[PDB]
C-alpha cells in the first residue's frame, strides 16, 4: 500500500535551549527519513517544540519574561540548532500553533463523544519535569536544589509533589486488552526488543484512568483550553503526542510554513506514523496512552515506536565539536558509537579514534585509491576483464550488502547498518591490499581494469547506502567518481554495475577526511 513514508522526533520542551538529546533524537529521525529518500519514496519528516504547560510556564517566571515570548525565543534557538545540523527535516512544528489547537480540540471532542473521557479526580504524585503521573511505588527519598529532604522520582530524579484535583479522566483501564492485542499482533511495533518487553509486563500488571485535564490555576494558564470548559486544560501529553495528527494534516509550501488545515488526515496520506523516534523516557507516552486515545478516537496506530538510550530532555556542545571535527562525522560517531544504551564513550579519544580509524584510513584512503592518477591513469571507470574466484567473493559482498542494510534501515538499527558496510569496505580495503593496483599500472593493465572497476563499484555502493549518515561527503564523493546525479538516489541504483565503464572521474582540487592529532 503506497503512502508518505511518515516519520517523526518528539517535540520538545522549551523550558531549555536545546543540547545534544533533542539533536541525536533528530538526527536519527532525518537518517531515516533521508534513507527512505534514498530509496525513491514520499517522505515527511517532523520534528518541533512542546510549548505548554507547568514545566515551561516556571521557566518562563523564572527568566522574568512572558510565556508567549520565551517559547518563541527558544523555538528560535532550535530551528537555528537544527539548520546549523544541516538536517532535512520536511517541518517544524510548534503547539502554539493555532491549527495544532484545532486539531487537539477535534481529538478531544471524539474521545469525550466516543464516552472514554469523565469528570474524576486525580490524587497522587507528579513530577513536573517530566509532567509525569507517578505511582508511590515510583517515587523515593532524595534532595531539592536547596539541598532539602524531598521526593523525588525513580525514573528521572526529578522532584515530586502531590497533586489533589478535579480532573477530566480518560478512560485507559478500558484499553488494557487491545493494547495488548496490539502488541502480540505487531511484534516489531516496538524497538528494541526488550523495550518492547518492557511494555507489555507494565501493561499486564493493569492500567489506571489517566488525567487528561488540569486545573487552569496549577498551569498558569499556559495551555489549551478543555473544549466547552474553560476552568481546565488540556494535559500538555494529550496536547504534546497530537502533533503527530496535526503535522501530518498540514499542507507546506516551498519555504516551510504551514499554509493548510486538512479536514482528513487520509487526504495528505501521511497518518499513522511509520517510525515514531523517541528517547527511552517517553515510552510510556508513545507506546501505551497514545495507541489508547488512537483506538479511543478509531485512527490508525502508528507501525514502528523506536527509543533509543539518552534521556530526551562537563559539556558536549554539537555545534561546537562538529566546527572541529566536521559535520558528518560528526553525525557518524554518534550514530556508530551508540546503539540501544547510553554505553560507548563519547570522549575526543575514541571520537579521533573513529574519525582516523573508519572514516579516514578505511574509507576515504580508499576513495583516493581508486580515483589517483597513479593507480586510475585515464580517469575513468574503465570495462573490467574477466573475474576471478576473490574478484567474484567481493562481488558477492557488494551485491548483498544492499539487501542487508536495507533490512537494517527498516528495524531501525542505523549502527548496524553502518557496521554492515564497513564490513564491506573493510573488505574492499583488503582486497586492494592483496591485488596491489599501485604494481599493477605496470604489469598488468588488463587486470587492472578489472580490479579498479570492482573497487570503483564497491566505493559507490558502500556510499550510497552511508549517503543518509553522510550527506554532504556522500555527494563530494560522488563527484569525485564522475558518478551521475541519476544514479545517486533510487533502488534501481542499488545494484551493482548501475554506472556504465567509460564514465569519466571528475576533476581534482583536496582531502575527504583529515586526519587528526592523538
Ligand atoms: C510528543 S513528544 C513529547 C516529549 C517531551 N515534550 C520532551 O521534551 O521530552
Same mark, same amino acid.
Not at 593507480?375 to 539487501?403: F, H
Not at 554492515?420 to 605496470?442: C, G, H, S
Given at each position: 500500500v503506497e503512502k508518505v513514508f511518515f516519520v517523526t522526533s518528539?517535540?520538545?520542551?522549551?523550558?531549555?535551549? +536545546?543540547?545534544?538529546?533533542?539533536?541525536?533524537?533528530?538526527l536519527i529521525t532525518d537518517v531515516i527519513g533521508r534513507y527512505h529518500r534514498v530509496k525513491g519514496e514520499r517522505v515527511f519528516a517532523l520534528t518541533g517544540t512542546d510549548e505548554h504547560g507547568q514545566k515551561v510556564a516556571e521557566a518562563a517566571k523564572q527568566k522574568q519574561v512572558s510565556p508567549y515570548d520565551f517559547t518563541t525565543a527558544v523555538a528560535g534557538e532550535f530551528k537555528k540548532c537544527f539548520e546549523q545540523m544541516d538536517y532535512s527535516i520536511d517541518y517544524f512544528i510548534r503547539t502554539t500553533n493555532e491549527q495544532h489547537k484545532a486539531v487537539v480540540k477535534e481529538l478531544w471532542t471524539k474521545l469525550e463523544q466516543k464516552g472514554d473521557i469523565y469528570l474524576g479526580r486525580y490524587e497522587g504524585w507528579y513530577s513536573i519535569s517530566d509532567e509525569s503521573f507517578l505511582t508511590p511505588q515510583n517515587i523515593?527519598?532524595?534532595?531539592?536544589?536547596?539541598?532539602?529532604?524531598?521526593?523525588?522520582?525513580?525514573?528521572? *530524579?526529578?522532584?515530586?509533589?502531590?497533586?489533589?484535583?478535579?480532573?477530566?479522566?480518560?478512560?485507559?483501564? $478500558?484499553?488494557?486488552?487491545?493494547?495488548? !492485542?496490539?502488541?502480540?499482533?505487531?511484534? *516489531?511495533?516496538?524497538?528494541?526488543?526488550?523495550?518492547?518487553?518492557?511494555?507489555?509486563?507494565?501493561?499486564?500488571? *493493569?492500567?489506571?484512568?489517566?488525567?487528561?485535564?488540569?486545573?487552569?490555576?496549577?498551569?498558569?494558564?499556559?495551555?489549551?483550553?478543555?473544549?466547552?470548559? +474553560?476552568?481546565?486544560?488540556?494535559?500538555?501529553?494529550?496536547? @504534546?503526542?497530537?502533533?503527530?495528527?496535526?503535522?501530518?494534516r498540514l499542507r507546506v509550501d516551498e519555504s516551510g510554513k504551514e499554509v493548510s488545515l486538512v479536514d482528513d488526515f487520509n487526504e495528505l496520506e501521511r497518518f499513522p506514523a511509520d517510525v515514531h523516534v523517541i528517547g527511552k523516557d517517553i515510552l510510556k507516552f508513545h507506546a501505551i496512552y497514545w495507541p489508547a486515545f488512537l483506538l479511543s478516537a478509531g485512527l490508525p496506530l502508528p507501525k514502528k515506536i523506536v527509543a533509543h538510550g539518552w534521556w530526551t530532555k562537563n559539556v558536549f556542545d554539537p555545534v561546537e565539536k562538529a566546527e572541529e571535527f566536521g559535520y558528518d562525522a560528526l553525525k557518524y560517531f554518534l550514530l556508530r558509537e551508540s546503539g540501544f544504551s547510553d554505553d560507548g564513550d563519547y570522549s575526543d579519544k575514541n571520537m579521533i579514534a573513529r574519525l582516523? *580509524?573508519?572514516?579516514?584510513?578505511? =574509507?576515504?584512503?580508499?576513495?583516493?585509491?581508486?580515483?589517483?592518477?597513479?593507480?586510475?591513469?585515464?580517469? !575513468?571507470?574503465?570495462?573490467?576483464? $574477466?573475474?576471478?574466484?576473490?574478484?567474484?567473493?567481493?562481488?558477492?559482498?557488494?551485491?548483498?550488502?544492499?539487501?542487508t542494510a536495507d533490512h537494517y534501515y527498516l528495524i531501525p538499527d542505523i549502527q548496524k547498518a553502518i557496521?554492515?558496510? &564497513?564490513?564491506?569496505?573493510? @573488505?574492499?580495503? $583488503?582486497?586492494?591490499?592483496?591485488?596491489?593496483?599501485?604494481? =599493477?599500472?605496470?604489469?598488468? +593493465?588488463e587486470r587492472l581494469r578489472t580490479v579498479?572497476?570492482?573497487?570503483?563499484?564497491?566505493?559507490?555502493?558502500?556510499? =550510497?547506502?552511508?549517503?543518509?549518515?553522510?550527506?554532504?561527503?556522500?555527494?563530494?564523493? &560522488?563527484?569525485?567518481?564522475?558518478?551521475?546525479?541519476?544514479?545517486?538516489?533510487?533502488?534501481?541504483? &542499488?545494484? &551493482?554495475? @548501475?554506472?556504465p565503464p567509460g564514465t569519466r572521474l571528475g576533476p581534482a582540487v583536496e582531502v575527504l577526511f583529515s586526519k587528526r592529532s592523538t
Open positions: 518528539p517535540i520538545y520542551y522549551v523550558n531549555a535551549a +536545546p543540547h545534544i538529546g533533542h539533536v541525536y533524537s533528530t523515593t527519598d532524595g534532595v531539592d536544589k536547596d539541598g532539602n529532604p524531598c521526593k523525588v522520582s525513580l525514573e528521572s *530524579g526529578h522532584v515530586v509533589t502531590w497533586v489533589s484535583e478535579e480532573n477530566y479522566m480518560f478512560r485507559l483501564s $478500558a484499553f488494557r486488552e487491545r493494547l495488548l !492485542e496490539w502488541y502480540h499482533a505487531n511484534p *516489531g511495533c516496538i524497538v528494541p526488543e526488550f523495550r518492547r518487553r518492557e511494555v507489555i509486563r507494565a501493561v499486564e500488571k *493493569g492500567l489506571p484512568d489517566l488525567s487528561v485535564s488540569r486545573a487552569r490555576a496549577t498551569l498558569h494558564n499556559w495551555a489549551i483550553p478543555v473544549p466547552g470548559n +474553560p476552568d481546565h486544560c488540556v494535559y500538555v501529553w494529550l496536547d @504534546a503526542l497530537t502533533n503527530y495528527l496535526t503535522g501530518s582516523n *580509524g573508519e572514516l579516514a584510513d578505511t =574509507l576515504g584512503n580508499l576513495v583516493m585509491r581508486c580515483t589517483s592518477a597513479k593507480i586510475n591513469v585515464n580517469g !575513468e571507470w574503465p570495462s573490467p576483464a $574477466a573475474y576471478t574466484e576473490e574478484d567474484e567473493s567481493l562481488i558477492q559482498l557488494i551485491k548483498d550488502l544492499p539487501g557496521i554492515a558496510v &564497513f564490513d564491506v569496505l573493510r @573488505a574492499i580495503n $583488503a582486497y586492494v591490499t592483496d591485488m596491489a593496483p599501485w604494481k =599493477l599500472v605496470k604489469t598488468d +593493465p579498479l572497476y570492482i573497487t570503483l563499484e564497491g566505493v559507490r555502493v558502500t556510499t =550510497l547506502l552511508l549517503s543518509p549518515i553522510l550527506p554532504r561527503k556522500s555527494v563530494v564523493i &560522488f563527484d569525485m567518481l564522475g558518478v551521475p546525479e541519476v544514479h545517486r538516489k533510487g533502488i534501481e541504483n &542499488f545494484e &551493482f554495475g @548501475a554506472v
